[PDB]
Amino acid sequence: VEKYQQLQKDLSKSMSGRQKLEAQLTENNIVKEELALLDGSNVVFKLLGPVLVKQELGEARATVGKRLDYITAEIKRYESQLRDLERQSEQQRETLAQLQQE
Amino acid sequence: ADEERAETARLTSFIGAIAIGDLVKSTLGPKGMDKILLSSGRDASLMVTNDGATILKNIGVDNPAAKVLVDMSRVQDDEVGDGTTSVTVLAAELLREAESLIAKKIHPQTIIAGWREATKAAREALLSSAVDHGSDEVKFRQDLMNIAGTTLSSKLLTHHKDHFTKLAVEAVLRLKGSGNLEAIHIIKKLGGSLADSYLDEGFLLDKKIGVNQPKRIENAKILIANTGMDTDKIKIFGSRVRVDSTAKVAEIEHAEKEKMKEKVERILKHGINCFINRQLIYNYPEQLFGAAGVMAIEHADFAGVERLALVTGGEIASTFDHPELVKLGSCKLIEEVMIGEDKLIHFSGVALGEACTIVLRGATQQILDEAERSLHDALCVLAQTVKDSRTVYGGGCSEMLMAHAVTQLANRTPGKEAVAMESYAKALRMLPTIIADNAGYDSADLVAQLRAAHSEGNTTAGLDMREGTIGDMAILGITESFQVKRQVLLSAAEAAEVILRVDNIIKAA
């Protein structure tokens, strides 16, 4: 029954964005190595928004760290919302399953 | 559910309360010999007390007599303060004496009737033992000095008692009228040494806004405030908690400052020398309070500030419902004074004349927690003594005459009255026992000395367990406030005859 689905639905929904963070998180680590590697040897660039800002080395690492951090925090965001959306489905299942049935 | 009938209960109600009225009287008295406190809840966890109120707490006792006598000495703590462990043994000197009569077959009814008017026959002899020392302000201050140490000693304070024996009477000397705890602002504070305790004459804020806001404020305009700067109190100058947008939880914090700005303007709209706010003042309106050049007092006391509202004459903003209308406190000078290890806001020359603020200096909390309680008992006593300024001849010197009196009463009368009353006046005569016995001195002679005194009758001389022997009753401190005594003597006198009604104890247990 539809009530059971949204909770399953929003589950993998907010699950989707939470995962790709880790690959970003992974490359956030990949760039830290290079932001530890670059002294600014060749022009360092953040790009956030349709503008490409002038970026400086020293502000970039704390950024990507925050970016790493900010993303790293975002494993917890839905892992809260995971069980949230996971639970409300299960609760209605036996009901709505049997409701589907009879 | 289960009948507990007369005699076997009357043993149990006695024998426990008999046991109860002992380790308290053991401890009771200046030479009253201590009892180790035992917390079976935490290991053995121990103190060693002269206080029976502690005794009840640590080791829980079940006697209906006790549970009554618990409440009695407790209400003798709740009312009389000092006299708790004394009213305890007070009925204890009865029940043992009653054991005889009870074992003698003698109806509690008899004793109920008999010790009753016996209880009275001394009462006015006790009121005769009531002797005014109010006769001068100094003589009552001498009387303030009389029973002050009398209370605090058996409450277990001595070294730092003297300072409090000193300090408390003058704050209470400001009363000269009803003893007023409104007027008396209690501050007991950690910090300072045993000599650093202090009496502010006025109201005092032991908190300090110090450097951030005004410190010294003359001719104070004192605004007693419940005014939330962060609280969103009535006359909300921005978006409250309400639904407008789904993100409104954030939108509430935005209008907060545009609320904090206007509210300081409102708090400035009074105009004040100081702003006493029982709730939060945030750092931003702080300098806005500073933009009003006003001492910003936040999280202010819920009681002192009320006394401040009472003693300095302020009126609380009451959730800031009066942007002008609210009345304001005025003291001649607001002085932040370093006392002990901290600075304290002192309001000098507050509206109320009786008003003070005592400032106690605990070197630790162990010093800070114990004394101010013991400090309190005399004051309530003294407060009664302020109203009715009286002593009774101590060291049993009141006791023997009353014993004598009721005994002189006894001889002629003895229906079931003096039969009891004879057994009664003994309890009047049974206190000097333990006091010399806690002191470790043969009471019989000394008693019979003090007997042969009040047999002869006598006032100026009674048993002194200090020296250990009979001595002058000059109101030396050796003759002690009637206020306690009657109260005490009013109290356990009933509990016996009261509980004498219940040999009829029944138990759902």
Partner: protein
């Protein structure tokens, strides 16, 4: 009636004394080891009775008084703590006598602490006032003490350190009491007893510098009681997302301000920053802290609130929970704060000299090993204790129990002098004393009963003319080879007997 309390008291008498006894064999350097089993299934060889109180016991309250008793003597002195066990029972020995006599607990009590006064007086002059301004006389006496006492190994080697940081925290020629407060015991794994040193400014645990300043000087020392990371939301910082549009929009907010809150700190004039533990914190994001280390503040993070309070009380860096709450009072000034890696394992931060309330000295005890570090820890300890005992009590009292053996003998006839029902009390009171070095005498062997008969008369004669001296552990001039102690350690070990007894005397 009061039987049970008397019984209790009798039991209390029996109980605590039954505890007070076995160490009287362990009493002194001549005393013996004790192998302590517990429910731990472990046999533990112990001469020190203070731990024997601590390490092993039952919960008996008068036995609790004992584990209470010397524990105070630890902080009271750190000396005669075993011996304040030895003092108490002796009186309690004399007690049941007076209770077999039936003397009254108030009467029993008031006779005694009084008599202790009466005792300490004659006792006091036995002691010799020695110069507390002269660090050498301080050295000598304490060192003589130290060499009249248990630990000379590192203590005497550490005595130039001990008395100095003391002499540092000694302002007066009186040398006051000299509390150990500003004095900071520190250690370093390994190192050396020579790598031990006093330090004039606070040696601190490790350091945080990402871009952070290593050496900063005249350094205003910041406290942080506030989170620099912005509040922790789903990890350390502010995130709300079910989707990346959500995260990418609000990510603007968290990043910028934590930099600002970082900024203002250096704007508040922090050359050093004390950050207590990230649990004592919300947390510090090391990248904004790298942004903060970029502020070239000297960041010491994850540090104890105690050390915060120590650095608060001692060198005067007071708690800062807010940017506004940064203030020079709450910012200590480190004339040099620079970490040092050397003389032993790894690095501890060195504030080299510092602005301090009073004067804050610290000592870093390093060793051949950790035990050798502890061999210093023990060593400075009582080396500082005898100081606190000698500086607080100038008068230098001899060891060996002779001070009793003189005074007990004295107070007896002075108790006799009292007459009254009580004259018997102070005798047995005094009489209690000389049995203490008796065991100690027997702890050295021979026959105290023979000796203490005589040393008494010796201490009826020249009063110090002979006495107990550990070299013999028997009849000797306590002054010849000096067995000496500050007047304090004695009077330390004194009243706790004349109190807890007088306490336990009137106990029901």
């Amino acid at each position: 009636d009061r039987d049970k309390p008397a019984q209790i008291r009798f039991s209390n008498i029996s109980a605590a004394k039954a505890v007070a006894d076995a160490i009287r064999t362990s009493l002194g350097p001549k005393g013996m080891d004790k192998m302590i089993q517990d429910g731990k299934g472990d046999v533990t060889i112990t001469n020190d009775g203070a731990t024997i109180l601590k390490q092993m016991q039952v919960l008996h309250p008068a036995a609790r008084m004992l584990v209470e008793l010397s524990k105070a003597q630890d902080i009271e002195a750190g000396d005669g703590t075993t011996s304040v066990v030895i003092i108490a029972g002796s009186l309690l020995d004399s007690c049941t006598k007076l209770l077999q006599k039936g003397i009254h607990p108030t009467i029993i009590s008031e006779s005694f602490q009084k008599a202790l006064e009466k005792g300490i007086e004659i006792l006091t002059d036995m002691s010799r006032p020695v110069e507390l301004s002269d660090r050498e006389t301080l050295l000598n006496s304490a060192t003589t003490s130290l060499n009249s006492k248990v630990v000379s190994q590192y203590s005497s080697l550490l005595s130039p350190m001990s008395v100095n940081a003391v002499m540092k925290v000694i302002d007066p020629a009186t040398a006051t009491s000299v509390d150990l407060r500003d004095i900071k015991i520190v250690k370093k794994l390994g190192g050396t007893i020579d790598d031990c040193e006093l330090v004039e400014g606070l040696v601190l645990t490790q350091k945080v510098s990402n871009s952070g300043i290593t050496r900063v000087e005249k350094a205003k020392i910041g406290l942080i009681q506030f989170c620099l990371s912005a509040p922790k939301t789903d990890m350390d910082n502010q995130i709300v997302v079910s989707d990346y549009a959500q995260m990418d929009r609000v990510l603007r907010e968290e990043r910028a301000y934590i930099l600002n809150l970082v900024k203002q700190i250096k704007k508040t004039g922090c050359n050093v920053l004390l950050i207590q533990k990230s649990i004592l914190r919300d947390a510090l994001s090391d990248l904004a802290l790298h942004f903060l280390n970029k502020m070239k503040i000297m960041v010491i993070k994850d540090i104890e609130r105690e050390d915060i309070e120590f650095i608060c009380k001692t060198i005067g860096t007071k708690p800062v929970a807010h940017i506004d709450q940064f203030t020079a009072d709450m910012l200590g000034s480190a004339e040099l704060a620079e970490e040092v890696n050397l003389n032993g394992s790894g690095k501890l931060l060195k504030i080299t000299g510092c602005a301090s309330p009073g004067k804050t000295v610290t000592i870093v005890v390093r060793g051949s090993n950790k035990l050798v570090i502890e061999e210093a820890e023990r060593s400075i300890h009582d080396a500082l204790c005898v100081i606190r005992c000698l500086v607080k009590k100038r008068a230098l009292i001899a060891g060996g129990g002779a001070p009793e053996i003189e005074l007990a003998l004295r107070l007896t006839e002075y108790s006799r002098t009292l007459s009254g029902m009580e004259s018997y009390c102070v005798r047995a009171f005094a009489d209690a004393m000389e049995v203490i070095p008796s065991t100690l005498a027997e702890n050295a062997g021979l026959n105290p009963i023979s000796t203490v008969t005589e040393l008494r008369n010796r201490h009826a004669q020249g009063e110090k003319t002979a006495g107990i001296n550990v070299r013999k552990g028997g009849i000797s001039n306590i002054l010849e080879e000096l067995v000496v102690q500050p007047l304090l350690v004695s009077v330390s070990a004194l009243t706790l007997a004349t109190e807890t007894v007088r306490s336990i005397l009137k106990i029901d």
